[PDB]
């Protein structure tokens with residue numbers, strides 16, 4: 001079955017793995033952490049032994065049963081490890097701790113009479129009928145009698161490509177928690193896959209999306225039900241909920257609660273809140289289902305776009321490049337892809353929007369339509385360019401030996417070959433500073449800033465700073 | 471003693487739940503690449519035997535470490551991969567569960583006789599994405615990188631580090647290739663060019679240092695001028 005079940009820590013939205021707001025560092029460096037900043041210099045790393053994973057333990061067990069605690073998701077065991085290396089620098093969405101992906105080997109029957117059910121050493125074989133639609137919609141294909149291995153989840157779908165790990169490569173992991181202080185493991189890599197272009201199953205939310213704004217309210221419903229289920233009182237105080245929203249004052253805290261609870265003026269319950277029974281109390285176990293880990297991960301992908309947008313606004317002197325990023329914002333891009341998937345729009349397929357820089361990927365930017373016989377002509381060229389790009393894409397990622405299969409492995413991208421290093425004005429920044437110092441004479445320094453990235457940042461602050469008005 | 475991590479109010483979705491783990495398991499990791507020496511075959515055997523006594527790693531610096539294998543001492547540099555790598559585990563062969571992400575590689579370079587040779591070492595197939603394409607103004611960039619360089623948790627530089635300060639702060643740490651074959655030279659080949667996060671951080675600091683000097687002065691003024699002079 002293609003039904004996705006995550007581990008328990010994932011469903012629980014376990015802290016610190018899942019947060020309401022991540023620091024901007026983790027937005028700026030997305031799923032990219034500095035391992036060297038968290039090891040104290042002089043530390044001697046000695047490797048510990050792997051905990052044996054009994055086959056009987058996970059035999060005929062569900063995911064959440066197989067992984068009940070964060071300790072079940074350790075790399076400090078003998079369970080095979082799969083490394084999914086993303087070809088995209090900025091994939092649509094990634095998975096957070098505990099979340100499950102399905103490795104699906106799609107096989108399509110050559111004919112109705114096809115009895116074959118091919119098995120690859122890893123992943124689950126899923127048979128596609130002859131008239132069955134493509135798992136990659138109209139942008140990818142599984143040919144009859146062919147297998148196309150695929151990364152499957154509720155957020156994205158992407159082709160994967162198994163490769164050999166260099167015999168020099170190993171996985172060094174650092175583990176701590178469960179009453180135990182940090183220790184290290186050194187493992188062989190069982191499997192290595194290159195993940196192809198990520199195709200969104202679901203849109204990435206926008207900044208002012210009602211889906212995002214409503215999460216704050218849902219996080220409240222959440223806590224309210226939990227507190228109620230604990231005391232059974234059906235009448236509680238607004239005091240223990242307020243500590244979960246340190247930013248909000250008495251007025252805000254009250255206002256937010258009245259979307260759910262009503263105030264008791266007179267009685268034994270006076271000075272307390274009962275929930276309007278227009279809302280039905282959920283048990284604690286079903287209260288977890290109110291927010292999915294996919295939902296959170298989707299918002300972080302959104303916040304990454306937002307962070308990169310404002311990181312560009314301040315520091316990017318390149319007008320043309322800045323404008324490109326604005327057109328590549330994930331909430332837009334992903335949306336247009338879902339449209340094109342429903343024949344409600346089209347994508348450019350090539351050019352600047354291609355995340356590869358060569359022709360080895362898809363551009364998701366929107367293009368116009370599409371007369372009568374002229375649209376059938378354009379459609380044919382469209383459907384052809386798609387298939388053309390798809391096979392170039394999959395062939396490019398199926399490369400075992402770079403130097404023999406690639407045209408020029410050491411070639412340089414268009415966008416990496418020619419970069420704009422100067423302003424439009426070709427000007428620089430001259431700063432004159434007068435600082436009374438030395439316990440004496442006023443000193444004057446004159447400074448020149450040749451870095452257009454700094455120049456742009458300096459001005460933008462000064463510009464907004466120059467306003468103390470209104 | 472085991473230090474139980476403190477939760478900050480308003481930062482969690484699992485608050486008020488009973489299922490809460492007090493001390494959850496947090497894991498991080500990087501790729502470790504060693505040279506195709508006769509010690510590679512030693513490592514393979516070690517992992518097979520389960521005997522890890524012949525392998526140790528001394529971390530000397532944020533990006534510099536010493537990998538001793540079978541009494542042979544290796545200089546290693548921690549480099550940033552252009553790709554993000556999801557580490558998954560599976561008991562199913564079918565259902566893959568996410569643990570942590572890998573975006574770095576500890577890269578063995580050459581055998582060394584003394585530990586402080588690592589700082590003089592240069593990581594192959596690496597560049598400096600703060601400087602690249604801006605090599606004209608690289609003099610202006612470097613002196614800021616020397617200033618900004620700090621030790622563990624923002625600590626002042628060691629006597630060791632300050633000696634090799636020029637090498638440490640100015641060498642490239644940004645690796646060219648992914649670990650998978652198709653992603654060879656992916657950064658220069660198969661990436662459409664974007665602003666680098668480590669680049670943005672640098673730009674941000676420079677802007678800040680310039681404004682902090684503006685407050686420390688009495689009268690200040692800035693003007694956009696032509697390249698002369």
Ligand SMILES: [Zn+2]
Pocket residue numbers: 176177178179180181472473474493
């Ligand atoms: Zn601990």
